[PDB]
């Protein structure tokens, strides 16, 4: 119905000047989602407990159902969590790790995940190995060091237990060869934890063909919902591992109340207090996306096509290059700044205050890179806007 | 300014018919809080990242400061958490437990806490003892079995490490002798984890004289803020125990990033994604309470006085009794129903649907009890309202 680009600006709820090149961090939802979001506040403020106890349940069961469809997965294999870090941790914590089990990560693994792994190792006797990845690299050359690491670990007599993988690197943002890495884990006997925080709502995803051991995603990053909102995919063949949430609560299951579906689903049903309304905007966001956006695929292809061109443009104006070896099969472009605390500081100051947009930077190799994010309301003009901005900002 | 009772109905945002005898579960906040809450949504929707990165910090530093004042505690000893269960767990998880350490709980300890303790014991070699408490009991008779348990445990050659205590029992709701129990832990060398989920905003609290080893509270239960909102008190003499949040994240601290106050405070500063707006309504709720409610004490005394009389009234109409041995020094009354799944079900059906109010019940000894909660907008009439309702509901 509405052609994408700036013609979609009227469907959303931002300052007309505000340029959102960073939608995934907090989210970006349409009018019909903020409306229905606000429609759920009233029903909470008009009858708190009847909303809570009766009117909340079924809409959540609906939202699960659509997400399970959007992943080509079974609704019984999908549960809702507060944020990604909770889900990944929830999986890690429930796994009984021996002293000979090895957890494999990469130099692209999210820092919070490394910390989570660092912490468990204090009271648990396992160990870890970090597959060195220094982008730009090729998709098969990553899988090369992976099976190189797994074969060494089996040669040392240890047991490659679990491998942490991500769809998109947080920053520097690329699409990792995660399908290939899931496969290598299948043949070797390694469990594949997939941190797909940037995944659903950005590019097509078929968990039925992928068959990932565990799949985490942040709906609030690309599914047009407010933060925090996530979901956890575990296939039935692995639902036995997860016996409790993090933190634990009433759905706990021991290895052997009256005021109160499979055991796995109730674990994530009887949990401490939660705001569920972001999850209850999944239907209205996925209806917007079928009726206004012309279906999921329509959205994905724009996000990929805006990201390709727009990123190459900004690269030129600055005089640098967009990280690449497709690792750019994503609505994200990570562009290098011509720059080899305060400065880094000041740069961001200008964005939020002066150019009411915002970008993320990172320390790499003799240069600082930035993360640009596409979305159906931006246009190639907007990315050329930021490009020229950044060049002057850079130089100043 | 406004006299309490139904004259305070105009300051809040509920259905005019709706009777809220259960405010603590979800919360009950005034107009000036929902307003300012909504004022923070716009600033998030107008400039997401500048709100997030600049405009969010100081108001949180303010909210901490008032809560630290309201507890007579230092602002450096107080951090914000998402809900209670997170905080209690966060404390439990960080404590290194030996195989000879004993965790002491009671038959009043929250079920989710028991589950949390059950779970850690699977991968950790400690053990536990449960002090049997069958209310109605006297305050000193609880402390009697407590030191009876601690002396036995030291007689068995084990080390009484930690003791889980609560200000208010979740249900059946009473005020436990927690001051006395904190003291007994001081002399014996036992750590006092206080689940004070029902505490702040309901009765005065001086952590400086109490000196609890760890103190958890749910602000959304009695401080006029929306759920979920909590806070964690740890005195400096124990801040060394807590090295990470649950789930872990960037503030982690090992026993030995660039896009980024004591170490304890940063742990709870660098955490995964969060909605902070309930915490940012602490100033506007505590201003309402000093200017409209006539100060904290004014609020407490009503809540205690409404709860005393109102509960005794409902007790009579039914023909039963309010649980008691002051254990009722709280704005909560737990009344026995003349009743010795579906029925229990149906009872609640009627409340939310028919009498658009809501109450909690529980299985006890030959009888089912209910939890009634006072608040500055209810009146003794409202509790006499529910009393007669309940009697007929009961009989039917
Ligand atoms: C966004 C993100 C996370 C965590 O998301 P939270 O909502 O902050 O838990 C983890 N890993 C990656 C790669 C991410 O991009
Ligand atoms: C309310 C309550 C809790 C937990 O509160 P959440 O916000 O659900 O974590 C724990 N213990 C007691 C006694 C409570 O009353």
UniProtKB/TrEMBL annotation, chains A, B:
Pyridoxal 5'-phosphate binds at residues 84-85, 110, 198, 273. It holds the Pfam family Aminotran_5. Residues 29-238 form the Aminotransferase class V domain. The keyword Transferase applies. It comes from the Eukaryota. Keywords: Aminotransferase, Pyridoxal phosphate, Transferase. The modification N6-(pyridoxal phosphate)lysine (covalent) is found at residue 221. InterPro entries: Aminotrans_V_dom, PyrdxlP-dep_Trfase, PyrdxlP-dep_Trfase_major. Coiled coil: none annotated. GO terms for molecular function: transaminase activity. The keyword Nucleotide-binding does not apply. PANTHER family: HERCYNYLCYSTEINE SULFOXIDE LYASE, L-CYSTEINE DESULFHYDRASE. This is Aminotransferase, class V/Cysteine desulfurase. It comes from Penicillium expansum.
